[PDB]
Amino acid sequence: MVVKVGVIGTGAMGRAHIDRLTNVLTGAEVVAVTDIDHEAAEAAVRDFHLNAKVYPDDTSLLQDPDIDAVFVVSFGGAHEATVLKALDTDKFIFTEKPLATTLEGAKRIVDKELTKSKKVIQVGFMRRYDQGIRALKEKLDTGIIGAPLVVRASHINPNVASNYSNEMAITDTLIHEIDEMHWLLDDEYTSIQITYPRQSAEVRNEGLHDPQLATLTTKKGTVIQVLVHVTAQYGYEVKLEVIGETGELQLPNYGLGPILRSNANQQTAVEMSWINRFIQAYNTEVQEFIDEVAKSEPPVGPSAWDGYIAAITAAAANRSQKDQETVLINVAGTPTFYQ
Amino acid sequence: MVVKVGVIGTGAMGRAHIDRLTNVLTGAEVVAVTDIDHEAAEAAVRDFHLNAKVYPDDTSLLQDPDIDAVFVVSFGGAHEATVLKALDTDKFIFTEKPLATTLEGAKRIVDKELTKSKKVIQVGFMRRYDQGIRALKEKLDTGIIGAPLVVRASHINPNVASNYSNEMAITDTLIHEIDEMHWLLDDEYTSIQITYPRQSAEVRNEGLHDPQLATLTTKKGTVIQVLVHVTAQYGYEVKLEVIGETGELQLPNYGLGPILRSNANQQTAVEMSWINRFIQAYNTEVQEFIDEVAKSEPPVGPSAWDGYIAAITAAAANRSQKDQETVLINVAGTPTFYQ
Amino acid sequence: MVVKVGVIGTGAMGRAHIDRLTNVLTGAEVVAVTDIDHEAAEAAVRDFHLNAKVYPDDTSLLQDPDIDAVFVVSFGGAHEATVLKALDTDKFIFTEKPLATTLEGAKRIVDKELTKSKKVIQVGFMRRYDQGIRALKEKLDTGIIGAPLVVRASHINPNVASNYSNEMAITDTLIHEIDEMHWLLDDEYTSIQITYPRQSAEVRNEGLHDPQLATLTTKKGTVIQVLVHVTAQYGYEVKLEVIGETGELQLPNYGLGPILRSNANQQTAVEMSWINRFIQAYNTEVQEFIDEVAKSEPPVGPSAWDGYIAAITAAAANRSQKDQETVLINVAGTPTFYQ
Amino acid sequence: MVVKVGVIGTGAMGRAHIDRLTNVLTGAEVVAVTDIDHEAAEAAVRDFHLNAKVYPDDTSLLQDPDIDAVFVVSFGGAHEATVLKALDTDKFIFTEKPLATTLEGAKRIVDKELTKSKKVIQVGFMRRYDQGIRALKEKLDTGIIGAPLVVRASHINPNVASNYSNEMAITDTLIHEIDEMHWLLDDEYTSIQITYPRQSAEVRNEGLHDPQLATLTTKKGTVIQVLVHVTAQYGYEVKLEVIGETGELQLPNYGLGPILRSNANQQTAVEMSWINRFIQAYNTEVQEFIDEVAKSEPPVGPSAWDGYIAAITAAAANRSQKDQETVLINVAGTPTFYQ
């Protein structure tokens, strides 16, 4: 059956999700929208040729009984209250990251979801759906390189907007690695530490440190070293290397474009857009959500608990940024509801 | 505006198309099927949970006024007659390759289609939709390596089934390159020549020469050298290199799997399945066709004329296979209907 | 013994050999030079800090009894007469390829050398000494990919000098591949065919066809397809791929330079000359020559016979250049003197 | 004329240097040896066919006035005294790393050499002479990626012998990076910290932690992250990546062995031996030293000052190894004598 969707927040990512659901993926229809900028919501209806109702707020949209699921794609800070409202309904919930902007708000959502008769929240941590990353995890899990000892990763971005802040290096950028690594390793974190190498001359934003180095430790003792570099200029790139007892695994270079021989060099193109980089993952993640809703089954993607783990770890990281000191992490055991 | 499809031939590729149309792609629905093996048609309905009618034959399916387009996915030798029948209707037509198993058959098709007020046939030459191959063409077309002088290509397959004949090295295998190269180069063929290097010990099929070397010449003078190697053992691989005046372009290695460092080697996996290799292309190809039907606009993919060029070239190659001599190709000028 | 060397021809490769003999290799001193351009000769003595006589011609240099060995590093068309004159002395002779530019010339050299009491000529077929090419051969010879069915090779140069003729595409360039493949495969040729693809707009030399395609067949039925492209612009490159029954072997990309990520690309430098690409091979071959001379023993590297065998195939190709037709080859057995 | 060399310590590396000087490189002769294992010394003369004197000790060797330069290749702990003895002569001195096993020792050497009229000591830090590493440095120095912000490196070794200690991870392994980085960056170290991820199950040696992570900071703020992994199993590998403001540079794939396509994989061999990995660099290093001596000019390779920087940094790392805490480094400004 067709999954009828309401979308809350019709900005860049909201419109991208509307486009997915309407023009790319199978089995869904967007039938309602809302945005605090009402004109943006109307524009989304026009631009995507939707047979949709425009509601003036989330509360109103959420009382539409025809909606099967909502996508929450507003400002991060607005996710918590909207998700909590939606939990008073029967509707399935896809929220973009973050689940909430504080670990307390995340706990609030978890606590409330726990009272329900089924899990209904999926969180937009798309990395887990990327075919390359998944393939590396799968190979790791065969045991072929033994136990993972060290993980080295990079999150490379060409430049940022004038409103990108130091804390966003964590909450908008590193958050992807924060969710990814515990999943990749099937392990839990014990600490995080953010350090600041020399400041790049390319930074244009007051207060923003770039690059930043993140070191995470896990219970089994695997150490993760992530380089975050958001004014790198050259491209957008995600790199991942796992060092094992008996071997190594790494992601191959991204891209399908040709190898060019020209002008005394051999070269391949580098993606400039995070959008194009993860297009597959976004499509896969959403398709899976829709596929679950269609069966009235709980989502199988990243959950509220995953959202909580990320929010705890982000908070620790933002703390670490103040003085570059290691911050401990100790998250509670995973509820059965969430295993 | 859902495009209602009937499928003629519900074998391996028929089912794969149904699956695409039903479960992966957007905007279509399979509402009718037929197969000379009636039990197979019924199973396709059951298997994909279709709301569809099973027809005794193609003629009867084609009388269904609710069908907007047919997919022709029967044995190759049956394509011609079915396509001709379908052209007595107003429906759009997607036929898998070949357009016809003889060039005269292909011409009968083109001649008949030319009598219509608009073009309705797309032929399933999916190479044109593979992202890697397209990306290469695109880069070529920027002029960055100058004019293409030589193309070197490989079509590598690990092993073949007992039904695989010498002529199939052309009709099943090289056919993809035969369609591809004229498109890549925006050119027309003038000759083809097949030569036989030493016979591989891995050949278990009567009459089969393997490997085979195909040399094609074009009007602008580009020489195309394709290695066809169908008992190669190691994997399935499609390679493409364009030699230009001022540089070269080549396809990168296919695959997203990790790089493994282990046991004194660095390695990546090689695909063993052509099916897997071209998933994307099949999806893109079909989604385009569906998208054009949804607008009641002619297909923009490979056409009946392309099918014709393929058939003529394939015939010439089969002729060359007899004595390893060069066979001339003189393709008629493209009718404006097909421009 | 320190081997006292004279060099005839002090252009690009003459200088390079003087450099290696003086500054890198052991057991040699350049004590005399000549070039038809006296200024070039003088420049070599100066630039390499030699204590060397500058002779007005080859004949005078050859009559200096203090010289132990001569290097012939002139224009290829000049090697024949110089080598024949040197055979009138008891000096050891290292000649760059080709041995001669005609079959008749190479045969004269062999006929004269055969009258001597001991073998004294080494020909500069350096490919045989290149560690990478040797490594490939060794792997091939283990049987890991089965029998070699097809060889694909490229010989790419960025540009040529004004004295480079169509005929030199064979005698100066393809000659390397002519020698190499016989050695690689331990097989002999039965035919060669040269074809002319689309003429490059980058050609600046009257009468030169570029690129050229060479097809060589062996007794065992291996087919070799060589691309010769001497106005390629982008760089200098040698490529080698061996297609076997059960796998393939390929020479890797040569390069020491770093991988640069910059400006939406990932790139590595390509060599622009032979002089650095094959420095190891040249060093190895020349050191081996010197080491034999020091012992007054015959060279063990490629001989005048190897040069003659190559010249036969080369002459066949020069014949093929005229009409693009296949020319047969059947070389004589190796004389005892040369075994 | 020939540089006459004495060798003190005729063990594995001493013999290998003798081989370099005798068989591989040009312009030197080993005329004297000494070892505390007087039979070792005797073996070297014999096995390499030296016309050399066996001296009963280093003091006696150094009194031989016909010796131009000495190679100090004894146990590391024995370098300091032998070096200071040799500084009571006028001889040139090549000492393998370390200059000394204590930072106090290295300081004594520095202090004595600075009394002398000219520099005579070179220390065997061969990384600087590796072609790839050198090419990367030079590219970095063009400014093409802007200022270096972070360096990421790996020193990967497959297994270690029984005698390999925790401290040797620094003194024998990381020491190469310790020398390399400040030279690469033209900067000075301000701190080092050694951390221990989970212990690999492959470790068989008491007290050895493996892997180890080393973090170094420099005066300009560059952060260097080195992974040291000596029980890695898969191979010997040196990796290096420089993260700049506007791009990145990294070492290319190493190796000249063939690419093998076989059994559903594409693979290349990995070096298993550091010995083979750095053959070129050792040759280059020693040839330069000899070339300098030959013209009676001071060495231009790594100096005693470099040896002292290494000793200090190694000491700080050994200190850090105790508690995983950061240890500051404050290196005195370079004496004018050492530039």
Ligand SMILES: NC(=O)c1ccc[n+]([C@@H]2O[C@H](COP(=O)([O-])OP(=O)(O)OC[C@H]3O[C@@H](n4cnc5c(N)ncnc54)[C@H](O)[C@@H]3O)[C@@H](O)[C@H]2O)c1
């Ligand atoms: N997972 C990913 O990789 C990924 C990437 C991009 C964005 N995101 C998530 O996107 C959400 C959307 O980001 P964006 O880039 O689209 O930003 P945006 O600014 O473009 O859009 C948000 C849109 O938010 C609407 N809005 C704000 N508050 C609202 C509220 N309380 N109720 C309803 N609408 C509200 C804003 O008016 C607007 O139209 C964030 O949580 C962002 O982090 C995730």
Ligand SMILES: NC(=O)c1ccc[n+]([C@@H]2O[C@H](COP(=O)([O-])OP(=O)(O)OC[C@H]3O[C@@H](n4cnc5c(N)ncnc54)[C@H](O)[C@@H]3O)[C@@H](O)[C@H]2O)c1
């Ligand atoms: N483009 C590609 O890469 C690609 C790949 C695979 C197949 N194909 C095309 O597939 C067609 C299908 O191949 P396949 O692999 O599915 O083979 P198949 O043997 O599995 O299936 C064909 C199915 O054909 C049915 N059939 C035969 N004649 C029929 C007829 N006259 N009317 C209705 N049904 C008929 C057969 O009974 C069967 O169920 C061919 O043209 C094949 O070349 C193209």
Ligand SMILES: NC(=O)c1ccc[n+]([C@@H]2O[C@H](COP(=O)([O-])OP(=O)(O)OC[C@H]3O[C@@H](n4cnc5c(N)ncnc54)[C@H](O)[C@@H]3O)[C@@H](O)[C@H]2O)c1
């Ligand atoms: N084996 C290799 O990889 C390799 C590479 C480059 C060149 N070569 C061989 O180089 C020879 C030299 O080529 P090059 O690149 O140095 O070219 P070049 O043009 O740079 O130099 C040849 C030099 O030849 C001198 N010369 C010409 N005729 C002479 C004669 N009769 N007697 C004495 N000197 C004469 C020319 O004046 C000149 O100084 C050829 O045989 C070339 O094929 C081999």
Ligand SMILES: NC(=O)c1ccc[n+]([C@@H]2O[C@H](COP(=O)([O-])OP(=O)(O)OC[C@H]3O[C@@H](n4cnc5c(N)ncnc54)[C@H](O)[C@@H]3O)[C@@H](O)[C@H]2O)c1
């Ligand atoms: N730079 C490199 O990469 C590299 C590599 C290997 C070794 N090294 C340096 O090698 C020195 C030699 O190492 P090795 O592997 O050959 O060790 P080794 O144990 O094999 O050899 C040293 C030889 O030292 C002789 N010897 C010891 N003390 C002596 C003394 N006081 N006077 C004279 N001879 C003495 C030993 O008896 C023996 O004959 C060390 O400093 C080692 O670190 C450097």
